[PDB]
Amino acid sequence: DQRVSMPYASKGLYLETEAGYYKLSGEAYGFVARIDGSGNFQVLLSDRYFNKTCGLCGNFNIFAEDDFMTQEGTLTSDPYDF
Amino acid sequence: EYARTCAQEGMVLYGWTDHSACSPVCPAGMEYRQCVSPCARTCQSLHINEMCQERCVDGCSCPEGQLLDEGLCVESTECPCVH
Amino acid sequence: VCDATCSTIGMAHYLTFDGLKYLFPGECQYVLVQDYCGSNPGTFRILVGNKGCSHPSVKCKKRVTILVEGGEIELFDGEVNVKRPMKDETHFEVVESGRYIILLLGKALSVVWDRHLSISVVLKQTYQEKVCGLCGNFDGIQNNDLTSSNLQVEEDPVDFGNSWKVSSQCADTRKVPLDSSPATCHNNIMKQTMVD
Numbered sequence A: 001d002q003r004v005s006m007p008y009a010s011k012g013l014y015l016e017t018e019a020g021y022y023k024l025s026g027e028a029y030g031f032v033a034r035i036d037g038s039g040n041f042q043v044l045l046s047d048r049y050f051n052k053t054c055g056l057c058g059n060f061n062i063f064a065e066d067d068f069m070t071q072e073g074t075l076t077s078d079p080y081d082f
Numbered sequence B: 001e002y003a004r005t006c007a008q009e010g011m012v013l014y015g016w017t018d019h020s021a022c023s024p025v026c027p028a029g030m031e032y033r034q035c036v037s038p039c040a041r042t043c044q045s046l047h048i049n050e051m052c053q054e055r056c057v058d059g060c061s062c063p064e065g066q067l068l069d070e071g072l073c074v075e076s077t078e079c080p081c082v083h
Numbered sequence C: 001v002c003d004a005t006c007s008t009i010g011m012a013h014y015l016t017f018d019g020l021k022y023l024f025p026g027e028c029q030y031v032l033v034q035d036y037c038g039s040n041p042g043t044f045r046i047l048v049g050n051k052g053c054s055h056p057s058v059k060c061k062k063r064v065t066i067l068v069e070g071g072e073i074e075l076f077d078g079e080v081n082v083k084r085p086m087k088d089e090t091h092f093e094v095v096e097s098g099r100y101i102i103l104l105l106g107k108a109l110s111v112v113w114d115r116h117l118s119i120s121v122v123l124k125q126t127y128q129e130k131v132c133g134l135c136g137n138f139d140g141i142q143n144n145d146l147t148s149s150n151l152q153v154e155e156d157p158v159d160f161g162n163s164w165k166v167s168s169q170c171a172d173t174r175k176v177p178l179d180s181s182p183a184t185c186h187n188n189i190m191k192q193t194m195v196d
């Protein structure tokens, strides 16, 4: 809850600005986030979680149809209740 | 989005915003380049090279000269010092 | 004149050549020492990079990237890694004797690494004020080891190392309120005396 300044680098999380756009790097933990001026979240993530990370950006598999596996684990046809 | 999605796949595209009549927003002094290096040579910087072999990234950046100093582009002559 | 020796005692301290302990908790990547300083060729550019190390803990794995003869050999997580072999492989040498990684690079350069944190670069008579960085200038004068990149002496070393970081848009560290007790020992007088 304490507002900090920027940039910021604690706990292996460099919180930087690149190309006038804000960045959050976690290369130890294998991810790089960022945002643009308008607001467009982006998430770069390694190959280490291939068939691991299940969530709202779906699994990191090859397929694209089966990447709605709910918090229970259920292939759903709706992109909404998921 | 479609620009970046193709860029990530190993095949970049160029200059598409020239005629598209839409450029993504950025603060003053900069506008949207494409494939600028992340290691932006700024003003209060050490002249070192061939460590930033990172991949090339999209985003707005300064003109040819006009080095960065605290969130704005400023001409190379007016580089300050610090104490 | 004898062979001087930097060091990185613990997580966040630095011992200069002429001999000057000072405090610098950083988190960005920093220039430990180099030769490209003012009016010289710029042969070697040893760097150091820390991650999560402003508060010393079981964390703070270092990353060391050393740039000599157009090469790129670097080390972290126990082993060394070559990213770009240098031209003159003749002077190159690596001696994994005991705890250490002794590491020659020429007639007038050497490095040591205890596999965990310590960085102790060792120079010869050759330079005698040809370098700069965190370890200072290697001149014998001990109070001019705070000559920042902008060519002046500071007094508060937390502002010194902030000049020597590589990524000029990452975080400059925060001026801590000085006190003889760090975070945990602060207001925990009991524990302080078992460590004392």
Ligand SMILES: *[C@@H]1O[C@H](CO)[C@@H](O)[C@H](O)[C@H]1NC(C)=O
Binding pocket: A051, A061
């Ligand atoms: C993925 O992981 C699941 C279980 O997590 C496993 O049943 C399956 O064989 C793996 N293969 C693919 C293509 O994800």
Ligand SMILES: [Ca+2]
Binding pocket: A058, A059, A060, A061, A062, A063, A064, A065, A066, A067
């Ligand atoms: Ca998928």
Ligand SMILES: [Ca+2]
Binding pocket: C018, C136, C137, C138, C139, C140, C141, C142, C143, C144, C145
């Ligand atoms: Ca000195």
